[PDB]
Amino acid sequence: GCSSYVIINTRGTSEPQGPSVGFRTMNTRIRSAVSGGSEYDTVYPAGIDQNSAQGTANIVAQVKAGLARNPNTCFLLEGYSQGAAATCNALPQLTGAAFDAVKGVILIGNPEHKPNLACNVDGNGGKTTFSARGISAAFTQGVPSNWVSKTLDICIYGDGVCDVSSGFGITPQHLTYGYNTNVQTMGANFGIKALQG
């Protein structure tokens, strides 16, 4: 059980610099159930930059800075949209102690969504987006094999960002994760169990 943890939250699109709309509810439940938490909101020019390399670097730096403060610090990594891509890009850079410290990765509307990974669920926890390809999947690696068992990759059916077969680009579905009640429940239960286990 993690006594001290950081929720690293990497936002999307044109969300303002601050907590993403996508995780607000599940985080209230995680922080309420598991003492010792804090939130770091990844600094990067979301919807203003050419890419998210800055977001990836700040995810990696905050994991390393937290472990330096307290080597038993745990992490949950959360990414929405371009922030889910930036989170996926961080995963290969988090090795040994830094890998062991990250207890769970929650992705919503992931542009790097990859077909047939065990972490893939839809908004209702089923398989309607299980084999889906994300809009960035042809050019990126998505969730590496060694991260699948601690990842939850939620793709709402009709979200063209994580499932190119059910929508073209940013579809209204892409915008709905923060007020999807089963998304928030799945995220909260995954994060609580990751930190307590």
CB of 12 to Na ion, least distance (A): 18
Q: Which is nearer to Na ion, 64 or 133 (CB)?
A: 133
Rounded Cα distance, 1 and 35, in Å = 10
Q: Which is nearer to Na ion, 56 or 180 (CB)?
A: 180
From 9-17, 77-85, 107-115, 156-164, give the range in contact with Na ion by CB under 5 A.
156-164
For the segment 50-89, give every residue that binds Na ion (CB under 5 A).
Answer: none
How far from 1 is each of 25, 99, 154, CA to CA, in Å?
22, 16, 25
Among 33, 67, 99, 157, binds Na ion (CB under 5 A): 157
* β-strand pairing of 5-10 with 102-108: unpaired
* β-strand pairing of 39-41 with 74-80: unpaired
From 5-13, 29-37, 107-115, 122-130, give the range in contact with Na ion by CB under 5 A.
122-130
CB of 162 to Na ion, least distance (A): 10
* Residues 62-74: b if buried by 16+ CB within 10 A, e if exposed: bbeebbeeeeebb
Residue with the closest Cβ to Na ion?
Answer: 123
CB of 128 to Na ion, least distance (A): 6
Q: How many residues interact with Na ion (rule CB under 5 A)?
A: 4
Q: Which is nearer to Na ion, 8 or 121 (CB)?
A: 121
Phi, psi (degrees; rounded to nearest 5) at 59: -55, -55
Rounded Cα distance, 139 and 37, in Å = 35
**Applying CB under 5 A, does 122 fall inside the site for Na ion?**
yes
Decide if 143 contacts 112 (C-beta within 8 A): yes
CB of 157 to Na ion, least distance (A): 4
From 6-14, 90-98, 114-122, 135-143, give the range in contact with Na ion by CB under 5 A.
114-122
Contacts of 50 (CB under 8 A, 6+ apart): none
**Applying CB under 5 A, does 156 fall inside the site for Na ion?**
yes
Binding site for Na ion (CB under 5 A): 122-123, 156-157
